[PDB]
C-alpha cells in the first residue's frame, strides 16, 4: 500500500519562499523508474501540473513556473521537496504530490511501459494561502430586501479562514445559503450568507457570525429597513 | 504548449445513466493518457491509465478508449458517488497537462433563479466602502451570467462571485455576486443594476435600485 502526505506552512506572505514536503511510504525513490510529481489546484479551478522527479534523479518543471521551482529528493528519508520562490496571491491553491509508477519489469527487465501513463496514488493535498494579511475579525453588515423574500449578512474583511455563520442561533436552516468566501485583492476574505423565506414571515432573523481566529462573535439582526 | 480540451465542460445526469466524457489533444499523445475522478474535498483518484487500462480496484462500469488525439471515458451505469468532476491528463509531452475538467451533477428540471439586489448598508458606507450584492437563488443548470451596470456603464474588474455546491434536496445552485466601490464612487452614481442571464429565463432579468432614493 502506497500512501503520500504533503506538509508545509498553511499561510505564506507574498515574495516569500514556500517549501512543501511530500513524505511517502510503500515505495522507495530508489525503485526502478519511479516518479513523484506535484500538482496544484487553486480554489474552484482545474488541476495544474508543476513538476516531477524520478529515482534516477531526472527533474522536469512546468515551463510557466520553471524559474520559481526547485524539486529535490531525499531517498533515505522517503521525501520529495518542492521549493517555490517569490510567491504571490495567485499561488494560493491546494498542493498535491503523487506517485508515478515506473515500467513493469520481469526478472529485472523492463517489459511494459503502459503503467507509467498516469499518476496512480495521490496525497490528500495541503491548502496554502498566500496573503500579507494579519489575523483580523470581520465587519458584519445587513443584506435587506415564488413570492419569496431574501435577506442576509455580508461578512466582510476577515482573515484567515474560516468563519462560521448560522441563523437564529441554529434554529433557522431551511432556505439558508452560506456561500464560500472569496479572497479579495486586499488579502482579506469576504462572504455572504443569505436566507429566503415566505414573503409573509417578514418572525425575526439574526445571523450569528463567529471568526475563531480573531475571537470575534457577532449576532446581527436583519430586518426589512424603512424604520 | 499542448492543449487538452474536455467536453462537455459540465454535464447533468441521473443515477443509472450512461455518460461519456471526451478529451481531445492538440497534437497526438499516443496512448499516454489518464482519467481521474475527483469528489469534492478529496484528491483526484485514478480510474484509467494508458488510455484504456482499468486501474486496480476501480469498478468495471468505468471504461476508457481512444489514442492519438481523441479519448473518451464512459461510465456505463452512473452511481451516486460518480457525481463529481472528471479530468484527463496527458503524459507523452512535458509539461504533463490536465484537461479543464468536466463536472457531472444531478439532473433536474430547468429552474430560473430568483434574483435580488441589495444596496450597501449605511453602516458600511460610514466606513468608506460600498458593497452591492446580487443574489441568484435556487437555479439550474449551474451556468449563469451576472453583469453589473452602474448608470448604464458596464462594470468590470470590480466584482467577485461564489456559487454553492449543488443542493442535496433541490439539485439547484445559488450564486452570490458582490460589486465593490469606494463610498466616494458609490455616491457619484444613481442606478445600480444586476443583469442576469440564464437558461431558464426567456430573456435577461434586471434587478436594480436608485441610490439614495428613500
Amino acid at each position: 500500500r502506497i500512501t503520500l502526505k504533503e506538509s508545509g506552512p498553511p499561510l505564506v506572505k507574498p515574495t516569500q519562499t514556500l517549501t512543501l514536503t511530500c513524505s511517502f511510504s510503500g515505495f522507495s525513490l530508489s525503485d526502478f523508474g519511479v516518479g513523484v510529481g506535484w500538482i496544484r489546484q487553486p480554489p474552484g479551478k482545474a488541476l495544474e501540473w508543476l513538476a516531477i522527479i524520478y529515482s534516477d534523479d531526472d527533474k522536469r518543471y512546468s515551463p510557466s513556473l520553471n524559474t520559481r521551482l526547485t524539486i529535490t529528493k531525499d531517498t533515505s528519508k522517503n521525501q520529495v521537496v518542492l521549493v517555490m520562490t517569490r510567491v504571490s496571491p495567485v499561488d494560493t491553491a491546494t498542493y498535491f504530490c503523487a506517485h508515478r509508477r515506473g515500467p513493469t519489469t520481469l526478472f529485472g527487465v523492463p517489459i511494459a511501459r503502459g503503467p507509467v501513463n498516469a499518476m496512480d496514488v495521490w496525497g490528500q493535498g495541503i491548502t496554502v494561502t498566500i496573503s500579507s494579511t494579519s489575523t483580523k475579525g470581520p465587519s458584519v453588515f445587513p443584506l435587506a430586501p415564488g413570492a419569496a423574500a431574501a435577506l442576509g449578512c455580508l461578512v466582510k474583511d476577515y482573515f484567515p479562514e474560516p468563519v462560521t455563520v448560522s441563523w437564529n442561533s441554529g434554529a433557522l436552516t431551511s432556505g439558508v445559503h452560506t456561500f464560500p468566501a472569496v479572497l479579495q485583492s486586499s488579502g482579506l476574505y469576504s462572504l455572504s450568507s443569505v436566507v429566503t423565506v415566505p414573503s409573509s414571515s417578514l418572525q425575526t432573523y439574526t445571523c450569528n457570525v463567529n471568526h475563531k481566529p480573531s475571537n470575534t462573535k457577532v449576532d446581527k439582526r436583519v430586518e426589512p429597513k424603512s424604520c | 504548449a499542448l492543449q487538452l480540451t474536455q467536453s462537455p465542460s459540465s454535464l447533468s445526469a441521473s443515477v443509472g445513466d450512461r455518460i461519456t466524457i471526451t478529451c481531445r489533444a492538440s497534437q497526438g499523445v499516443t496512448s499516454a493518457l489518464a482519467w481521474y475522478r475527483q469528489k469534492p474535498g478529496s484528491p483526484p483518484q485514478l480510474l484509467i491509465y494508458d488510455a484504456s487500462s482499468l486501474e486496480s480496484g476501480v469498478p468495471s462500469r468505468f471504461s476508457g478508449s481512444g489514442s492519438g488525439t481523441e479519448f473518451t471515458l464512459t461510465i456505463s451505469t452512473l452511481r451516486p458517488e460518480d457525481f463529481a468532476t472528471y479530468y484527463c491528463q496527458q503524459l507523452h509531452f512535458y509539461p504533463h497537462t490536465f484537461g479543464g475538467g468536466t463536472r457531472v451533477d444531478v439532473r433536474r428540471t430547468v429552474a430560473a433563479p430568483s434574483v435580488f439586489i441589495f444596496p450597501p448598508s449605511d453602516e458600511q458606507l460610514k466606513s468608506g466602502t460600498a458593497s452591492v450584492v446580487c443574489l441568484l437563488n435556487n437555479f439550474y443548470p449551474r451556468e449563469a451570467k451576472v453583469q453589473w451596470k452602474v448608470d448604464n456603464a458596464l462594470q468590470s474588474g470590480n466584482s467577485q462571485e461564489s456559487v454553492t455546491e449543488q443542493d442535496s434536496k433541490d439539485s439547484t445552485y445559488s450564486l452570490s455576486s458582490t460589486l465593490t466601490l469606494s463610498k466616494a464612487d458609490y455616491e457619484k452614481h444613481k442606478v445600480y443594476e444586476c443583469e442576469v442571464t440564464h437558461q431558464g429565463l426567456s430573456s435577461p432579468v434586471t434587478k436594480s435600485f436608485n441610490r439614495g432614493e428613500c
Partner: peptide, 7 residues
C-alpha cells in the same frame, strides 16, 4: 519535449 518513457 517528450516524456521520460516516450519512444
Amino acid at each position: 519535449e517528450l516524456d521520460k518513457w516516450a519512444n
